[PDB]
């Protein structure tokens, strides 16, 4: 049974500085002690990343966002409210949609003709604990893909990159400690590849799934939740690999004349 959570008006956006974050390993190739110039979809340096407050403190506002050419997603929470994502086009029974949901022991990824709720969420009950996906969708049929593995998900900062190229949905991720609030940290950390899913569907829009506790819409409560969303662009990067093949630095060649010089000369 779907319930109406989004009974409030839409809140205005906030923005933060991406600094030098959102860089991922462009391929599965080992390189070391070398500066490599690569052209791929990357999050532009020092760009404005949208900061969303899906649950503000009981204001529930968890919008459907465009996917564009790829999405940079990040969150900092210990409450395990963010569980997963929905990717697709019409996000209804007319087309195939990708549902990624994490839980206590596993991650379940399905591609089906899901009929999603207007403002879908994961239902969590306490008796032992019970969890239901029927608060996300009413029904689903014509499933084409299924994958099950281990969970994808101071404070812990979780970063993901979502791409959809030539039928492959590519996920990159990184998990780091953070002692800051209301922003993204400075410094460099590359995101390692997580999984390549041979799905073969179109993605133009996506939504974040939050878990709510049963403790009709007025009976569903959760603590504050927030996340950051950026978008990838066709950019040229100079990536610095150390002796162990770990990327320790990077230059966004279009950030400024100085960066252009570094990329031209292949030097930091």
């Amino acid at each position, epitope marked *: 049974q779907c319930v109406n959570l989004t009974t409030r008006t*839409q809140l205005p956006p906030a923005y933060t500085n991406s600094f030098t974050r959102g860089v991922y390993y462009p391929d599965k190739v080992f390189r070391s002690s070398v500066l490599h110039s690569t052209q791929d979809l990357f999050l532009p340096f020092f760009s404005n990343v949208t900061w969303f407050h899906a649950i503000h403190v009981k204001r529930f506002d968890n*919008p459907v*966002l465009p996917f*564009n050419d790829g999405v940079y997603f990040a969150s900092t929470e210990k409450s395990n409210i963010i569980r997963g994502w929905i990717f697709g*086009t019409t996000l209804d029974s007319k087309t195939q949609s990708l549902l990624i949901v994490n839980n206590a022991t596993n991650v379940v990824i399905k591609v089906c003709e899901f009929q999603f709720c207007n403002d879908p969420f994961l239902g969590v009950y306490y008796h032992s604990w019970m969890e239901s996906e029927f608060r996300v969708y009413s029904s689903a049929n014509n499933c084409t893909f299924e994958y099950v593995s281990q969970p994808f998900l101071f404070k812990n900062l979780r970063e993901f990159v979502f791409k959809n190229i030539d039928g492959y949905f590519k996920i990159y991720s990184k998990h780091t400690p953070i002692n800051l609030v209301r922003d993204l940290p400075q410094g460099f950390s590359a995101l390692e590849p997580l999984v390549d899913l041979p799905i073969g569907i179109n993605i133009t829009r996506f939504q974040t799934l939050l878990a709510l506790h049963r403790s009709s819409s007025s009976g569903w409560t959760a603590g504050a939740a927030a996340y950051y969303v950026g978008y990838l662009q*066709p950019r040229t990067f100079l990536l610095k690999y150390n002796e162990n093949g770990t990327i320790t630095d990077a230059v966004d060649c279009a950030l400024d004349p100085l960066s252009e010089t570094k990329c031209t000369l292949k030097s930091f």
Partner: antibody
Amino acid sequence: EVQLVESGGGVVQPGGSLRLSCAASGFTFNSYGMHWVRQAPGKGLEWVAFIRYDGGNKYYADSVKGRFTISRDNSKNTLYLQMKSLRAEDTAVYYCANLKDSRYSGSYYDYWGQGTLVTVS
Amino acid sequence: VIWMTQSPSSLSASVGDRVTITCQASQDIRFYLNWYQQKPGKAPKLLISDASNMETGVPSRFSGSGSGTDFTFTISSLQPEDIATYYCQQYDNLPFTFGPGTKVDFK
């Protein structure tokens, strides 16, 4: 919260030019593609142009292709339309819009501005 | 370029009457059709997306359906505030196009 404000309208001679602009606020403008739509007096809606979120790919209606140029500045949240070689037939109210589109722009919300009148005579 | 047409170009109906507007595409556009409602002096309001999905805030008296080339917009019980020009718009491919527009008047 969401606003779209067209400006730069007015009266110009045939064969002349005019640059329109639309100021966006209340939403993350740099995440969405944007459209221009025009409506001549007594007529229906006509699609004019579309630009992607990154300001890269641009598309035009055949009736304005080669004359109009669409552009955007994401640091100012401003959408622009540069019209060259204007004709009497181009008299219309011009709107900037974020049209709900599950195929190309990925917009889940439909937003329109107020409309700015362009007269060519 | 896909051509769009609507029929009738104009209809009159009274309060409580059922109003149907037909939109036809020259090419198969699947389920990618929007419906807009425009009143004089105002920008168009979206009522239906993806052929049959209702926008939030739109009264339940509005509905629509169809697939491929032939689509229908329906008002199950016309109200005095429903007097407007309705447009269909395809977004299956670029360039996007709007239909001629159907004016619903008051009987």
